[PDB]
Amino acid sequence: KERDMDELKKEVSMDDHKLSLDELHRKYGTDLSRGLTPARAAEILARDGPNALTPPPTTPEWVKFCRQLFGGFSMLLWIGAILCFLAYGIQAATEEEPQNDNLYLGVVLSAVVIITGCFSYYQEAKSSKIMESFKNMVPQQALVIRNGEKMSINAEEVVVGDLVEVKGGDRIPADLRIISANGCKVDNSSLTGESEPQTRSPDFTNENPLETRNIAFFSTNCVEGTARGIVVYTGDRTVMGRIATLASGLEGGQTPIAAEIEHFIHIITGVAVFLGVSFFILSLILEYTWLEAVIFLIGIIVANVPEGLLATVTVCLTLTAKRMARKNCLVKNLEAVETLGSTSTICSDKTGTLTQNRMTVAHMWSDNQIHEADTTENQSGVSFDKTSATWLALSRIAGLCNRAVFQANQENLPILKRAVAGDASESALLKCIELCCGSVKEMRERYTKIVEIPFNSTNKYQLSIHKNPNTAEPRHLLVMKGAPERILDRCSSILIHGKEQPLDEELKDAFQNAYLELGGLGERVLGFCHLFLPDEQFPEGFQFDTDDVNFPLDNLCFVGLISMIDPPRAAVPDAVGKCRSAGIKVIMVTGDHPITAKAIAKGVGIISEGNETVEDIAARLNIPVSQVNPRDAKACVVHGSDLKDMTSEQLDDILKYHTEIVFARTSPQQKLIIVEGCQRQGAIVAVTGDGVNDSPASKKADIGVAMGIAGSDVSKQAADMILLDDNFASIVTGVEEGRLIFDNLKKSIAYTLTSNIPEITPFLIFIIANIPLPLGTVTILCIDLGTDMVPAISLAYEQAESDIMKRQPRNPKTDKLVNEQLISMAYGQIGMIQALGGFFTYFVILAENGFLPIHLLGLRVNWDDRWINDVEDSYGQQWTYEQRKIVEFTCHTPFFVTIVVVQWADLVICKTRRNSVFQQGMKNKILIFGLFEETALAAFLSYCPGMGVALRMYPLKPTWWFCAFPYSLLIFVYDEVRKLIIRRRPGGWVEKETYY
Amino acid sequence: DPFYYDYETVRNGGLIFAALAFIVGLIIILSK
Amino acid sequence: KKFIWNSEKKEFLGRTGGSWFKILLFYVIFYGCLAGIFIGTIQVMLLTISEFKPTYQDRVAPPGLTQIPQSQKTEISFRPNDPQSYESYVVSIVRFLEKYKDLAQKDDMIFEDCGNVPSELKERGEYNNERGERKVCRFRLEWLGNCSGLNDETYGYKDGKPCVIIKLNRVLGFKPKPPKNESLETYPVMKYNPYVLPVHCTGKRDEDKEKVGTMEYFGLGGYPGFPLQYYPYYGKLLQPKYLQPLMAVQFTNLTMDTEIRIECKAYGENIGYSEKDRFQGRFDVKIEVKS
Numbered sequence A: 001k002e003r004d005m006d007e008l009k010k011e012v013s014m015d016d017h018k019l020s021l022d023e024l025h026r027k028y029g030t031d032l033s034r035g036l037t038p039a040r041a042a043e044i045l046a047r048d049g050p051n052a053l054t055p056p057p058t059t060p061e062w063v064k065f066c067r068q069l070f071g072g073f074s075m076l077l078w079i080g081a082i083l084c085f086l087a088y089g090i091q092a093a094t095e096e097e098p099q100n101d102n103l104y105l106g107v108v109l110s111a112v113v114i115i116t117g118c119f120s121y122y123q124e125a126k127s128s129k130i131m132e133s134f135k136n137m138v139p140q141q142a143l144v145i146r147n148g149e150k151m152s153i154n155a156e157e158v159v160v161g162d163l164v165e166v167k168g169g170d171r172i173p174a175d176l177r178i179i180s181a182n183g184c185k186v187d188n189s190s191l192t193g194e195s196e197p198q199t200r201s202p203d204f205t206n207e208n209p210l211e212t213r214n215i216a217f218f219s220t221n222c223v224e225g226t227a228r229g230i231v232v233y234t235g236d237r238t239v240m241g242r243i244a245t246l247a248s249g250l251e252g253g254q255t256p257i258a259a260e261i262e263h264f265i266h267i268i269t270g271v272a273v274f275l276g277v278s279f280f281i282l283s284l285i286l287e288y289t290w291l292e293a294v295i296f297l298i299g300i301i302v303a304n305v306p307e308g309l310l311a312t313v314t315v316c317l318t319l320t321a322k323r324m325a326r327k328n329c330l331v332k333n334l335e336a337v338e339t340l341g342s343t344s345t346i347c348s349d350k351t352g353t354l355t356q357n358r359m360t361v362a363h364m365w366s367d368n369q370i371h372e373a374d375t376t377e378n379q380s381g382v383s384f385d386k387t388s389a390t391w392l393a394l395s396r397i398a399g400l401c402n403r404a405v406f407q408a409n410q411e412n413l414p415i416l417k418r419a420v421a422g423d424a425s426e427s428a429l430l431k432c433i434e435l436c437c438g439s440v441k442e443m444r445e446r447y448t449k450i451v452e453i454p455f456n457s458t459n460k461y462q463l464s465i466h467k468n469p470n471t472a473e474p475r476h477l478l479v480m481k482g483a484p485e486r487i488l489d490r491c492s493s494i495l496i497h498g499k500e501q502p503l504d505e506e507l508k509d510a511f512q513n514a515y516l517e518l519g520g521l522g523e524r525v526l527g528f529c530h531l532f533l534p535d536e537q538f539p540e541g542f543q544f545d546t547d548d549v550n551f552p553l554d555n556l557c558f559v560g561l562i563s564m565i566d567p568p569r570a571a572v573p574d575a576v577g578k579c580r581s582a583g584i585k586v587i588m589v590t591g592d593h594p595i596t597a598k599a600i601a602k603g604v605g606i607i608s609e610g611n612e613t614v615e616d617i618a619a620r621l622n623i624p625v626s627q628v629n630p631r632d633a634k635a636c637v638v639h640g641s642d643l644k645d646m647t648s649e650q651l652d653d654i655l656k657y658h659t660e661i662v663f664a665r666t667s668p669q670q671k672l673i674i675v676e677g678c679q680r681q682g683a684i685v686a687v688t689g690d691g692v693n694d695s696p697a698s699k700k701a702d703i704g705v706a707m708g709i710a711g712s713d714v715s716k717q718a719a720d721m722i723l724l725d726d727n728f729a730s731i732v733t734g735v736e737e738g739r740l741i742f743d744n745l746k747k748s749i750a751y752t753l754t755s756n757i758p759e760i761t762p763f764l765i766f767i768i769a770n771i772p773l774p775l776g777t778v779t780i781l782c783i784d785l786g787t788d789m790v791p792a793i794s795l796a797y798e799q800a801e802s803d804i805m806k807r808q809p810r811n812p813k814t815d816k817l818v819n820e821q822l823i824s825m826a827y828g829q830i831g832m833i834q835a836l837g838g839f840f841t842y843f844v845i846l847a848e849n850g851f852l853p854i855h856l857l858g859l860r861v862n863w864d865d866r867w868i869n870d871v872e873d874s875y876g877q878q879w880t881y882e883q884r885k886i887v888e889f890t891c892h893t894p895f896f897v898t899i900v901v902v903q904w905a906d907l908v909i910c911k912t913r914r915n916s917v918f919q920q921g922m923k924n925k926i927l928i929f930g931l932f933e934e935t936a937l938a939a940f941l942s943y944c945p946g947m948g949v950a951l952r953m954y955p956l957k958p959t960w961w962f963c964a965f966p967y968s969l970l971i972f973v974y975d976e977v978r979k980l981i982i983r984r985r986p987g988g989w990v991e992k993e994t995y996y
Numbered sequence B: 001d002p003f004y005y006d007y008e009t010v011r012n013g014g015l016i017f018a019a020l021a022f023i024v025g026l027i028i029i030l031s032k
Numbered sequence C: 001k002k003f004i005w006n007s008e009k010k011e012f013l014g015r016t017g018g019s020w021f022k023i024l025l026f027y028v029i030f031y032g033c034l035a036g037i038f039i040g041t042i043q044v045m046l047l048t049i050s051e052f053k054p055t056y057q058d059r060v061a062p063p064g065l066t067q068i069p070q071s072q073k074t075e076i077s078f079r080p081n082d083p084q085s086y087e088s089y090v091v092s093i094v095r096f097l098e099k100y101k102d103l104a105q106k107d108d109m110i111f112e113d114c115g116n117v118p119s120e121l122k123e124r125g126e127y128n129n130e131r132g133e134r135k136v137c138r139f140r141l142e143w144l145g146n147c148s149g150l151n152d153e154t155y156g157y158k159d160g161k162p163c164v165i166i167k168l169n170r171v172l173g174f175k176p177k178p179p180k181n182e183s184l185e186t187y188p189v190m191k192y193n194p195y196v197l198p199v200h201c202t203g204k205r206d207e208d209k210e211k212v213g214t215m216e217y218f219g220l221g222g223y224p225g226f227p228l229q230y231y232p233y234y235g236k237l238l239q240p241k242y243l244q245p246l247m248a249v250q251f252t253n254l255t256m257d258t259e260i261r262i263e264c265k266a267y268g269e270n271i272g273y274s275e276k277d278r279f280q281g282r283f284d285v286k287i288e289v290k291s
């Protein structure tokens, strides 16, 4: 009965914060100023569990090893090995001197699955081994007030209903209920997704427990100020606890690559049992008994199983995963490497993933003119004109009138990614001055501060006064900053290029429109002004104490507005554009304010410049918003408050009739519903996030991508891919590699599937025409697990035939990894020519040694006999047993060589699916080495001392090595003209029937 | 007698070719 | 999803009718061209070989040594009383010697009377077709004394003390070369070393050599071997109805109700052996006359 437990977690949380202080004191029974007694503390601590998320479900190493020993591809080889021991059981107990070929093969198939499990397991486990090196769990302490005394205990030693105090810089331990605030600003970024530092007030503000201000949250950090509260929720019953436990209990789904592998096995066994059954019935119709026919059935079906294709595909995926690890893109799953390419809808998180999740100085308003600043994390953009008097004024208004400085170790760290204490706004301003205006150390101490006036609770303004060390004027310098409404009410002078002017409305309205431009853009604007103090009314000894009116509040000189916002990450816009360039539907999913979400969406590409929403049209026509037709709005913003009152059909409609969607104010449990909505269409979903709100989303999606450093640990663990460097362009890299490895995979499949026809046809016509065995078992192993290993792996190294980032994403119902065209090529045409080429060399060796092909009919009866040492050929010669068996084995060896020779041309025609070998180019050095290794290995398996003994692969007369050349060249020419007709005729006969 | 094939000549030659074709591919994958 | 059989928009087994015809026609033309190509190349291959000689003859360098009772495991186990116990043997012996009767070798245009004494080799020119159909030297059953008889349709053979004739593997152009007069300890044999290929039987270990008491050999004129006047072979095309030499071996003093191993080793310079092929040159048999 765990279904009800998960269902009670998918629902949005409820609370009881909206209570009076006396009612709360009665419900929890705790002194609001002294707290509770330590006895009651330990009494609860040993009553419901310590304040800490219960550990994740430990995964023993033998479990995931056995996991790698199963699955889709491995299970096929398991039924094959079991069928080998079954056929061997039928062969041992029923006939004399049974041949050890079947058992010899069964153990090999088992070893194939086991070794593949060892390699793949060591790989997937290595990905988690480097993950255990990223958990830097520093046990932090909490400040709890108990028995009237403040004490710092461990966060796990905290109980329910106890007084807790926080200092600006501390992390909120458990979920509290704010009872006494003082300039408290917490960071609910990793949880609800609120970007700007949200303030916390003891009064009840909103019915929703998340948007309200009287609740402190788990894993949130106190940015500035102090606050008191009562611990309402502890342990897993917390907000982020109820989210983490939800992510740990959700389903993973089925990767698309796994579905393609399953369907591929379906076709493989579909034709395997078809040929095995039709030939079993045909064999019984001929002459063979049930005993023999069963062995034939098992042989035909098992032979149709690509034995080596398992490891070649596993390595094929591991190689592509290596390039992911090089670019700091870790994949915990060995198949999730491909999922980015088959993706068609990306649900990205705004704060932390799309944006830098850090307040930064956006624009300026110098000389009645907007000036955009560099808002990149690595500082690689256009710089504003920084050589004017208005700049030297404004920069000092920021470099002096600000309560923000650096810290101890902040000396070698970069200018932006360094720790700064104080307000987020003041930190951003300090950074922009420390970068675009020299330094602030000597620039701040050069002006000895006299008096300061901090921000007010009402009419927020921060002013101060400083001395003037300029060697041109010994007067004073008064500076002030504040909201753009506080500076407009206390100013009359205006600065321009160095001189002053009145507050003329012709330029004051020019200030108002510039305020609404930076305001409607989702940014927070600030005003900076200063005024000279006459040294004749306030000489260099008058200490204007902070009591009464000592400075001229009005007649100040305004320098310019300075807006700010959390900017998007560096390559995020270009990357989003690249995704849309391929056809990937980008949908922003965040729980922040729509005012900022829409602005950042416009600034990254999720909202195209020109497309309007249902509200934008109404605002453009001065008409009620409920009149316009939603079909006229290509894009739409969805307020999460409205999403609560929606059904499945409605969200389906939101995604069907709107191309650009922006979900705002969405709860963590709602992101799950959004992802499921995008999945109800039938498309592939990739959710990129960082905070804990993206944990259930990054878990239910087909693939979850978490940020490596700027993301929490819950969502990072519950994800399928991690961007260790937070470079969002790795998403574009991933989708490129996913489509690349998909097509290259098809090529490797067609390669290994082509060799099956010449591997099985000798045994088929062996039964029909009753000729001596043309191809042995060990030789087949030398082909599937020997020579063809390097070619198949080298085929994965092929590059793009055309621009893959241009074509639309693959359709899951139409574009399959193994379509019926591929089987018509490998099993149908190519492999058939290879089989004929092998039978050619067969008849060549036998006819040259005295057994003409016409005479080989019905000869296997006495040929396979061990004691008939007087078998007649076409010349009348009598061959013994070993003398004719030597010819049979030295006939298997050139058949093996023949397969290698035709596989040369097959590997080259498989290198290009649509292009020509001349167009593409033999630059795949892995493939070149594949051909040379394949050839030299085949030659070594024939001319080495003891091959005719260990493997019965006797040496070959040099004339045999050329019996396969015409068939190989034939295959090359036919497939080349096929790829040529597909080039000149993009119609579809040669395409829709063969082009796989 | 025609009932004898100098197998050692072809075998030794095939081994030398097998060694050369392998080391050539090795040099191929070592572009330096 | 697996009921794509048909629809009202024409699909059968997955595709339409016109598509089935297009694909079937293409595959028929394609496979027809493939068959024609394979046949043409196999024809060129047929043009690279002659009718009077196999190109490669090195895989039959050491000729074999077979026997008449092609036993399932080279073992002769029967009862001296029960006639049905040894029927499988006698049937094969009669069918083998059915082509050696005096009535079978009656045409004088294809048969030539070699002689009652083993003589030198008979080379009938080259192996080409410039000459007509070569002659085959006759070999009457009378040469194998005590293992031929003048019996009726059923050759009443030996129940006690059985007979096992040996035969040298027929090889084209092979000229047998008996060992030099400097015989390196070859188990007492007659002094007719120059015109007959010697073949001597023996046990296999100290036990088999003791159980087998006495052996009597029979051949052309009384020599235990094959006369050189019947070699070399000129192929089935140029010498049809050819009769290779035969030599019988009878085991008189055997230990009844005991399986004993016999190794009949043929000696000569052009006769090789093999530790892997117990039939190349030598020959093994497991006789057991259980009463």
Ligand SMILES: C[C@H]1O[C@@H](O[C@H]2[C@@H](O)C[C@H](O[C@H]3[C@@H](O)C[C@H](O[C@H]4CC[C@@]5(C)[C@H](CC[C@@H]6[C@@H]5C[C@@H](O)[C@]5(C)[C@@H](C7=CC(=O)OC7)CC[C@]65O)C4)O[C@@H]3C)O[C@@H]2C)C[C@H](O)[C@@H]1O
Pocket: A087, A095, A096, A099, A101, A102, A105, A291, A292, A295, A298, A299, A300, A302, A303, A304, A305, A763, A776, A777, A780, A864
């Ligand atoms: C009752 C009478 O029995 C009289 O003996 C007979 C009977 O007992 C009947 C008895 O037939 C055998 C024999 O012909 C040998 C004949 O042998 C063929 C089938 C069994 C094989 C072991 C063998 C060697 C290749 C091998 C198959 C098994 C397959 O599964 C393969 C492993 C398969 C692969 C699958 C894959 O994944 O890769 C390749 C391709 C072919 C294969 O490589 C060929 O299989 C046939 C079933 O021949 C004996 C001589 C004696 C007296 O007359 C007595 O009175």
Ligand SMILES: *[C@@H]1O[C@H](CO)[C@@H](O[C@@H]2O[C@H](CO)[C@@H](O)[C@H](O)[C@H]2NC(C)=O)[C@H](O)[C@H]1NC(C)=O
Pocket: C145, C146, C216
């Ligand atoms: C062939 O078998 C006959 C028996 O039918 C053997 O004739 C006997 O020979 C011995 C001498 O070895 C005489 O003592 C007997 O009197 C003979 N008996 C008969 C009935 O003739 C003959 O020796 C055998 N031939 C060979 C070459 O061993």
Ligand SMILES: *[C@@H]1O[C@H](CO)[C@@H](O[C@@H]2O[C@H](CO)[C@@H](O)[C@H](O)[C@H]2NC(C)=O)[C@H](O)[C@H]1NC(C)=O
Pocket: C213, C214, C253
């Ligand atoms: C044939 O073999 C028998 C043995 O089966 C020989 O006769 C035996 O000789 C030993 C003495 O060495 C006696 O102990 C046995 O009693 C004899 N048995 C019989 C049945 O006589 C006999 O000498 C052999 N004869 C020939 C010609 O080889």
Ligand SMILES: CC(C)CCC[C@@H](C)[C@H]1CC[C@H]2[C@@H]3CC=C4C[C@@H](O)CC[C@]4(C)[C@H]3CC[C@]12C
Pocket: A764, A765, A768, A820, A823, A824, A828, C023, C024, C027
């Ligand atoms: C031993 C002998 C008799 C077996 C004969 C099997 C031949 C006739 C079979 C084997 C595989 C078959 C082909 C398998 C693949 C294709 C593509 C498919 O979409 C239509 C059928 C078609 C075109 C088949 C035509 C007939 C075919 C070539």
Ligand SMILES: CC(C)CCC[C@@H](C)[C@H]1CC[C@H]2[C@@H]3CC=C4C[C@@H](O)CC[C@]4(C)[C@H]3CC[C@]12C
Pocket: A844, A959, A960, A962, A963, A965, A966, C041, C044, C045, C048
């Ligand atoms: C249209 C053109 C290019 C096709 C011409 C066919 C050529 C390439 C084919 C036809 C017959 C073939 C030959 C058939 C006979 C022999 C002898 C044999 O023991 C080895 C193979 C060898 C040496 C073949 C080499 C390639 C060959 C000459």
Ligand SMILES: CC(C)CCC[C@@H](C)[C@H]1CC[C@H]2[C@@H]3CC=C4C[C@@H](O)CC[C@]4(C)[C@H]3CC[C@]12C
Pocket: A935, A939, A957, A958, A959, A961, A962, B009, B010, B011, B012, B013, B014, B015, B017
């Ligand atoms: C299509 C072309 C470019 C591929 C080049 C590779 C060909 C020409 C090479 C690959 C393997 C080679 C063979 C390797 C083995 C033998 C046995 C040796 O004792 C004599 C040479 C001989 C008979 C070679 C003939 C040439 C050969 C067939």
Ligand SMILES: *[C@@H]1O[C@H](CO)[C@@H](O)[C@H](O)[C@H]1NC(C)=O
Pocket: C181, C191, C193, C194
């Ligand atoms: C072999 O030597 C013997 C004497 O040792 C002699 O009688 C016989 O004629 C010789 N045979 C040949 C062919 O030289």
Ligand SMILES: [Mg+2]
Pocket: A189, A190, A193, A349, A350, A351, A352, A353, A689, A690, A691
């Ligand atoms: Mg986030």
Ligand SMILES: [Mg+2]
Pocket: A303, A305, A306, A307, A755, A756, A759, A784
């Ligand atoms: Mg295979």
Ligand code: NA
Pocket: A251, A252, A253, A698, A699, A700, A701, A702, A703, A704, A719, A720
């Ligand atoms: Na997952």
